[PDB]
Design an enzyme around this catalytic site. Sequence first.
Site, mmCIF file in Angstrom:
data_model
loop_
_atom_site.group_PDB
_atom_site.id
_atom_site.type_symbol
_atom_site.label_atom_id
_atom_site.label_comp_id
_atom_site.label_asym_id
_atom_site.label_seq_id
_atom_site.Cartn_x
_atom_site.Cartn_y
_atom_site.Cartn_z
ATOM 1 N N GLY A 147 45.475 -120.816 30.126
ATOM 2 C CA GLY A 147 46.486 -121.331 29.200
ATOM 3 C C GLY A 147 46.570 -120.594 27.875
ATOM 4 O O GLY A 147 45.763 -119.705 27.594
ATOM 5 N N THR A 148 47.547 -120.982 27.055
ATOM 6 C CA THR A 148 47.789 -120.333 25.761
ATOM 7 C C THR A 148 46.711 -120.712 24.754
ATOM 8 O O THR A 148 45.976 -121.676 24.954
ATOM 9 C CB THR A 148 49.163 -120.706 25.161
ATOM 10 N N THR A 149 46.630 -119.955 23.665
ATOM 11 C CA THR A 149 45.582 -120.162 22.669
ATOM 12 C C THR A 149 45.916 -121.324 21.734
ATOM 13 O O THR A 149 47.041 -121.442 21.254
ATOM 14 C CB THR A 149 45.343 -118.893 21.829
#
Lengths: 111, 244, 241, 240, 195, 231, 250, 235, 243
Positions: free
Chosen positions: I29-31
């Site tokens: 997933g994204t940060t």
Amino acid sequence: QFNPYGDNGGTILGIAGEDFAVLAGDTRNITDYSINSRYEPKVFDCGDNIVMSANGFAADGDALVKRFKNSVKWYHFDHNDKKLSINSAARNIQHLLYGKRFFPYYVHTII
Amino acid sequence: GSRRYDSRTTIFSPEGRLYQVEYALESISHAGTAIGIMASDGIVLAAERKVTSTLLEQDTSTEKLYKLNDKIAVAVAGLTADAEILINTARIHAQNYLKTYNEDIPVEILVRRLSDIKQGYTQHGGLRPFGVSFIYAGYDDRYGYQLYTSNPSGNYTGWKAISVGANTSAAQTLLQMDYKDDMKVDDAIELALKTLSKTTDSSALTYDRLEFATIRKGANDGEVYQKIFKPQEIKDILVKTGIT
Amino acid sequence: GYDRHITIFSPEGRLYQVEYAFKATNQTNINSLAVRGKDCTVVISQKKVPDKLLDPTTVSYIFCISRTIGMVVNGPIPDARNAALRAKAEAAEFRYKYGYDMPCDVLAKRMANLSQIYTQRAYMRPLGVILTFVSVDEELGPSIYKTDPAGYYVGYKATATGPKQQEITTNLENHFKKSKIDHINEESWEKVVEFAITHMIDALGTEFSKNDLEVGVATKDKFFTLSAENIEERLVAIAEQ
Amino acid sequence: GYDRALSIFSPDGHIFQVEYALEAVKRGTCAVGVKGKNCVVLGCERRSTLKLQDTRITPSKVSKIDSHVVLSFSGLNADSRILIEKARVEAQSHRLTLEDPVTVEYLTRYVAGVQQRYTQSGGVRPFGVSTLIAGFDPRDDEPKLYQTEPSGIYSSWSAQTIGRNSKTVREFLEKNYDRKEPPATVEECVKLTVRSLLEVVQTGAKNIEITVVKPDSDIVALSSEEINQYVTQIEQEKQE
Amino acid sequence: MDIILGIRVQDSVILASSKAVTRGISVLKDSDDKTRQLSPHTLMSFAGEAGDTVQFAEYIQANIQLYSIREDYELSPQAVSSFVRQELAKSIRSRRPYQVNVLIGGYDKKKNKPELYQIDYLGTKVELPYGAHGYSGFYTFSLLDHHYRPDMTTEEGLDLLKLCVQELEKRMPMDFKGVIVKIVDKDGIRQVDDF
Amino acid sequence: NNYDGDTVTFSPTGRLFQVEYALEAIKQGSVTVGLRSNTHAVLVALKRNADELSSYQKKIIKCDEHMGLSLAGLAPDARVLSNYLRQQCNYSSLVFNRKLAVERAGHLLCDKAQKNTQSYGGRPYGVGLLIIGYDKSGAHLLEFQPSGNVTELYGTAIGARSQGAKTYLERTLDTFIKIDGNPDELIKAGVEAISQSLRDESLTVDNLSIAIVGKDTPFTIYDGEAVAKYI
Amino acid sequence: MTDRYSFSLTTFSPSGKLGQIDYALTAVKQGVTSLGIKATNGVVIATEKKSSSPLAMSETLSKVSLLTPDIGAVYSGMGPDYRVLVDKSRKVAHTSYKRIYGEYPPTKLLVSEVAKIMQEATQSGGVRPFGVSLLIAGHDEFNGFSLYQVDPSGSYFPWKATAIGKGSVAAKTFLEKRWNDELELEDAIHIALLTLKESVEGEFNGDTIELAIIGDENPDLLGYTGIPTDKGPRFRKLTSQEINDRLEAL
Amino acid sequence: DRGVSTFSPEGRLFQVEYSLEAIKLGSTAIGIATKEGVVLGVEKRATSPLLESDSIEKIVEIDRHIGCAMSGLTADARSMIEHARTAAVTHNLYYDEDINVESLTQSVCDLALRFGELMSRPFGVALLIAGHDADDGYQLFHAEPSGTFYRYNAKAIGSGSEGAQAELLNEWHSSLTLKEAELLVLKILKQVMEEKLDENNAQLSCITKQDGFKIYDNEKTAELIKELKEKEAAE
Amino acid sequence: TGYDLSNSVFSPDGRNFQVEYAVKAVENGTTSIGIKCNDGVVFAVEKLITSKLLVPQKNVKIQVVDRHIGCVYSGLIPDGRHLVNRGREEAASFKKLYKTPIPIPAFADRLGQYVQAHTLYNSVRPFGVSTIFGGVDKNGAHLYMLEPSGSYWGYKGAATGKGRQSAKAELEKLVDHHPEGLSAREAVKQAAKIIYLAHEDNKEKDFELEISWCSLSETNGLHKFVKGDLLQEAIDFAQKEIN
Ligand SMILES: [Cl-]
Ligand SMILES: [Mg+2]
């Protein structure tokens, strides 16, 4: 003891012509010997050229109209936007009212 | 989910057999032999205890023969613990019938209901069947003396003489050979013991490896008596027939 | 081999899921130790805070179950907290139902019975934790009772748990062989804590700073954990002797 | 509750559990139903590997559901009792509400509905049983013979057989039964039923059961000697 | 409902049951049969609350008929009466009890004896030589105490029954429109058409 | 492979294959396009037929006077989800006398689809939805995926060959967003968008399905001769 | 969520074996040796206290448990399974008997209830069988003294004397030689200590051996006086000191 | 094994797809919709000559204005019909009117996917629901176990479906009379049926606004069969 | 083997492979990050702009619990929403009974126990999110990070997602360089920078920055989104640092 009913007074009147029909009702709302509102409508347009009024105990009147209006809405969803005929609306209202046969809506209904 | 670990106890094989019922019957075939013989004036129940130990308390023991009511008894073959669950149910069913109709329960009705319970475990619930075969010996005023057997499938049948458990094939051949319809109780007692004595996997048949019972009308006038034999009484009947 | 996936017997009469839950116990790589004084029960545990971004005050494997009972866990923190919350709820309910504070050994048994259920019931997994309960019981006095994933539990004169538990155990065994008694013959809890730390240092062969340790102390009518400065004060006392 | 979907579709579009239940029926002892002009006859095989039986008390193969309808079967014996019990209860329930006994079609339709329900209910296996349901509707003299099977399908038959070696006896009935002229009397109908079982049975001793149902709740089971007379008569005519 | 009588004689049981069905100030029917045949040799008459009476009678009738089919065997009058009593004994502690009183007249084929059971809506069972429910008993019991003999014939029993109906017609306030009489014996159940 | 037996199982790379297989059902479904301006929102749906004798599967469903969606994938699942929306829109009206925000509508669908991906026994919904609506914060367009992921967009498309229409809308973004106070032109842009996903077949009178909602326009669907204007 | 295991985990194999019961018996075999001997005026039950650690206090762990004032139990196999069985056994003696009849159940019936519980774990949904064999010794007015064995299957057998667990085969052979029907309670305790020494390897004293008796009534252990009919519990756990006294005259 | 409500990698429910195979094994059923009415015809397919073919009920009345034909595991249809009948009558009770053919079909199709781990498996039967209402006139629907329904001008289901559907494609036009449709069903049934078509092994029915739903007699169908053969020989 | 095919099954190591597999979904997933400051906390997240068609500022990922707690997560977004919905129910029942708003450590355990509960049975799937959350209560500021296993700790700085290692390294520098403390307005600017620096591990698609914050002085103890001038100020600060 808590009494769940009340009398909000007023009166309604329906007359049918050859190609028209009227539903009239006074706009007075009362409790006991006090006036609550001099303009509180109780004759409603429910869609599909049906007008309705449930006179008596206003809480039960508004609740019933609300349910019937909602019944018209779902009749469209479930039956391809078909128009609810006045005879079908009448029968639908019978089931709404009788559904509370043992704790009635204290209203005289006219459509 | 849990599907991974489901044995699926209540399913059919490609041949149309119930796996768990067939395997429960395989289990029962290793259990001590139990024999029922119906005579014209009574019924005999004889059962071989499973390889006895010398320190086993023999007199205050109940493994094979159980009492359901005053008129009906059963001989067990299989898991004792399973049998006791079914026996307590059967005992209750008999009392429900008595309470309802003020009459002792007819043998077949009790048998059917117990067999219907077993049937239920083979068709629904996802549980293992009861690894038990019964021999029902009883009396009522409709059919008189009756022998039945039920098995894990929930199927029951009536008999004149029958064996369950181990070596039923050999035991049934011997019963079929020497049995006849005008037989008396005392003759049936002898046949039951003679059959066990030949079909036993033990070296010699002794009193301490046997349970025995008779249902006679040998009480006083038109009434039935159940006799669950005591160790000393089995010892005497074994000598009387000339087996020991 | 699905007999290794759920809690049912293997051919050799073993429950592999219980055995693997025991191995999850050492996943944190932390060693604990519990000893009893005259008036008190002291439990100590290693505190390893590897990440610099962690708030070290929130990193704890010691729990205050009730006012009187304390509990240290050997195992992963999620299961540790699961066991802690339940123990707290059980101890609170016990007081409400029976009108007196739940004893340390009774709670241990109750938690052990819960653990046992997971080893017999299939849908529940065992918790990968070893729970060490400590208190000064009003009847039995200083008490140490330990629970594991098998549902086993027993009282202890002293105990140790973790990867290097065996070294700590024998270290304590040898002391009680020498002292000839069931406890640390000491008046103040402060010196019982000093004993606990000293013997852990000898067994493990490592030195400790104030942030390398975590200390719980049970006295009559209260269990409490020591702050970093309370431990530092304690470490100074050991060093100056 | 146990929820598992035991009866399910396979890639080829078969429900194996229902089809394996048919194999259980195929294993069961043969049962035959033949309806005449004014009667129906239910014949049933009884396997002779079981001697030392007590035929007084042993469950009979043909069962009365009401005073005017009967039910025989092939397949698992224990399973049949559950269907028979339900059918008997529904029979009394119908008399109670409709003030009239069940028609043979209605009773069949009920039993078939029960069998069907067990083919798409969770946690249950299908009934390893096919039934022959025969009788006469109230105030009616037209004979009725119906068949059901584990899947839940049912249908009317002029004559039909189920169980083991049923394909052999069905072969026999197919050429020997005339639609234009069914067995005019009771004797003719019983004889044709016995003949059809004699193709499969073995001996005509205590292996064949015959039950005759006639209009207005007139049901009677034949004894050994009565059946043996048909067996004796058929064999003497055969040697020709 | 109102009048139901029962007389057990030497070889039979005789049940008389009033024909009137009244509601308010109107006799709605004057040919009502207040009885059900539970089995070929067992007859149950009933009286009590409107609706409950028939609903209960038919429910019992169905259960006894179901038993008969299942076992291919007729339950004894004693067995049926015990079943009925238990149903009423359950009923009385229900949310809405069956307010039904019954007489069960039966001929036991195994004993070759007639049997009359009186059971009220509470589940109070008694075997009697003669029975009645409601206000009828206040006249008929004393009358039968005097005139009844245990060894009477069916014909003598019917004359004894006529004597009860006459007394009831004379002294009872309400018009119950006569009775339907039925005889239970070794040959089963039959109705007397001219009474 | 071994991790696609049910929705409750993660793969070793952290994938839910049953959710991805449900996503695959959308790609098989017929193309549908969604786009909006600041005054109106428009759904355009290519309907599919079994054969020439059959009717064309209806793709667009009305939820309230101010909201509705178009579907791509399992139609029965769309019926379940649309019915759920109808109830939530209706609950908001009866209880709060308040038209349900299109954003909340999306949040409710997300949470309903999610519960099916985390529990044993159940399955993911096998349908994608494009919800349009006009509420108190103007026109809206949502894209629902049965993974649970709901996304608010200016325009989009889902179904087979939806990449053609999606690329077109990505180019036309600056044009169609400013078609304010003009229904017919916003529809034309949508009809031209869905045309980029066509292969061999073209838009006919009983093939095309268009819906619109806006400032002074209740959610209304156009089929049959009513869409002949736009071919 | 919820217990989805509503199906049997113990089922019949093609050979007719119930695998999980057999494996439970294997777990009992691994367990420490326990034994029971019935005398004319009492019963003795005994077992080794296998200490998990020398730091552990083996007094806190009770392998021999009181079920009723006149009934006691000991086991071989899995201790946790035993512990919960004792809890259930104690409760069932009250709920299914004492609260109905106002008196404690006879040995055979309490044994029957325990057997039922263990049988249900053999057939009910989502559970394994109990991994223990119980030896239940007890006394009641109408049956006198009795000794029962209860296996994982739910089967129970009455014994004059027997042993279960690790060295049960050798221990049973030893008991066969020594047992007679005229044994007094003190003679049975003596034999129990002899039989148990064979299986025990390490230390053999009152601290490593747990032993209890079902013998005479103990008015001193009752806790109150004034009711003549109430005479005290027949179950008594022998103290560490009481065992060592008998080990000198061994 | 595997879940009942499981998706395949292609994005289809295994059990729904397998039930479609069962329906292909079923006996042929054909429906044709015209402006004078909708005709429904079925292959009876008696498994043996002893079976009384008139007891084979594969065409069924739901209401006076709605009929239904089935194909596949016909035992599964009983509860579907029962539901449809209740739905139709219930709607009349609540609204004092006939229920729309589409609304009826939709109500039946709601049952279809109510299976899983509700019933244990999908239905193994497809339905052709024909009817008439005041709004949309004469209608023919094909209701599958997938929960999906399509309206058709004409439709064939069962073993001879793909062959019959191709034939219906050519033959159907919007100006068919009822009589023309009757013969067309008989014609196409005779082509795809294994055994030779007659009044005993094939059944016809129709629904008209005036007379409602009517199953034809074996006498009436026999004359249409004879009328059909003569017309094919006539050119 | 086969130990990884079912949730709540211990491997011979003593590991639950299904939870470790859920972690892989989080890593994918994204940060997202969390920064604890003087008198509050700051949350920030990377929103990958998949297409031009995404409406800016209208796919909000940071969620509020009660009125004082902020939650952000990386991984399966729907799972995160389910967890927050639960959090809101937990916070509501706490306030209902105890009157006071739920303390952050109390709230942390409520989520912790709930996530841990999804590792106890094979009939449920572990959560596919690591959740960074926190706020201001009576005892001051708290920042937490919760993982699929149910494991959580208090943090000075927290980071998860595809660029977690880049963000962690940057967070560790702030902790070292600011021992006395970081201010709320500073933490907002730093949060922007760290998301921009952590974007280097996800640099195919360009992104949209989203920041929220709780602060006793700046937001009066309540959770608010950073918008408008304060947001653009933080973006410019981050843009200046990458170049
Ligand atoms: Cl407990
Ligand atoms: Mg009375």
